[PDB]
Amino acid sequence: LPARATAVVAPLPEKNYGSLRGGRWPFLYDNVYGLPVVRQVASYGEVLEGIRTGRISQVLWFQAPRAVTASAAAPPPGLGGPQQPQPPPLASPDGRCLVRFANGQVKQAVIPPGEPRISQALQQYGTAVSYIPLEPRYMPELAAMRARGAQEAVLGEVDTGAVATPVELPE
Amino acid sequence: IPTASKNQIALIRLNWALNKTNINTFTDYSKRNNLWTTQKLRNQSK
């Protein structure tokens, strides 16, 4: 049912926005997922001025999973005990974030979580600071499900194509 | 965790106990014991 087109495409010239270097990718949508790639990159001063003037409506930081041994809410897992739930995810140390403007435009930025001037502007001017939760393939709670879906079959020609991941009702 | 780690944790727990019995500070030569014990026990019959 989906398209299966294949053509020769000339990649775009490599840019240099300063904050984020490259970006050619002549397709509007990426592979794997198929969502629109955020081609626009917002600089640090532009993000600061957009927060100050109110043109920026939201800042969403990406997240990275936190190591279990980096969790201080329990005795360390080296000591014998319960397995404990996964610690809450960290903000992304690479600083990658999406900036949603008031006109609906989404831009890319590299803002370090903990930067004084940006954090002060986001505190004073009440711009909504969010954290994108995680990917299901990068969530440590769903790592077993990702591994089982990668290392096992998907249909085994058993019935037909209409469910999602039917390990309860096998294939 | 390995069985050696579990045994070591058990030995640390065994050392944690017997300190929780609160007998570690008792000394038969304490001035506190010499105040009661060796004061009624020294007069004796004589």
Side-chain angles (χ1 to χ4, degrees):
Chain A
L1 271 283
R4 289 164 289 272
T6 291
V8 53
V9 196
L12 299 182
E14 174 145 22
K15 273 92 78 175
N16 193 28
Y17 298 102
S19 40
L20 282 157
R21 187 207 153 77
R24 305 160 259 185
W25 194 246
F27 305 118
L28 219 57
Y29 307 87
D30 68 318
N31 40 6
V32 184
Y33 282 97
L35 304 174
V37 189
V38 185
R39 204 148 320 269
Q40 296 181 81
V41 167
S43 51
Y44 160 78
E46 207 214 31
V47 162
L48 190 64
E49 271 302 314
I51 292 159
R52 281 187 187 143
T53 44
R55 325 174 302 111
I56 284 170
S57 52
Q58 199 174 12
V59 178
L60 308 103
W61 263 281
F62 281 86
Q63 287 195 124
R66 206 200 296 259
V68 169
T69 63
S71 168
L79 328 183
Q83 217 255 2
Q84 301 281 331
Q86 201 73 30
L90 265 163
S92 82
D94 43 30
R96 310 293 287 272
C97 74
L98 296 167
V99 175
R100 174 178 76 82
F101 286 80
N103 46 26
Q105 289 294 310
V106 191
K107 287 202 181 183
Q108 276 190 54
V110 177
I111 306 165
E115 165 138 32
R117 191 54 92 161
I118 280 295
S119 71
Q120 256 160 46
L122 289 168
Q123 278 150 15
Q124 306 312 119
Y125 314 108
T127 292
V129 170
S130 325
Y131 292 95
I132 297 143
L134 254 183
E135 243 173 280
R137 71 172 171 165
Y138 291 133
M139 262 186 16
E141 302 103 272
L142 291 186
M145 271 329 109
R146 169 205 206 184
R148 144 188 312 199
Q151 318 163 329
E152 266 91 336
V154 71
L155 83 171
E157 212 274 339
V158 160
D159 204 332
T160 57
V163 64
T165 324
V167 299
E168 301 275 279
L169 312 93
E171 318 313 276
Chain B
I1 61 142
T3 206
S5 288
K6 222 184 275 191
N7 275 61
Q8 200 194 14
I9 284 155
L11 295 167
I12 293 158
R13 182 239 310 146
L14 186 82
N15 272 297
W16 173 90
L18 154 79
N19 178 260
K20 258 41 182 186
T21 56
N22 305 310
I23 63 175
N24 48 88
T25 52
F26 178 75
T27 300
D28 204 23
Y29 313 99
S30 39
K31 302 273 183 267
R32 184 191 311 231
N33 262 260
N34 303 7
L35 277 181
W36 280 266
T37 307
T38 323
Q39 267 186 24
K40 174 68 188 203
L41 297 183
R42 188 44 97 174
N43 184 266
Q44 69 211 316
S45 62
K46 141 196 65 65

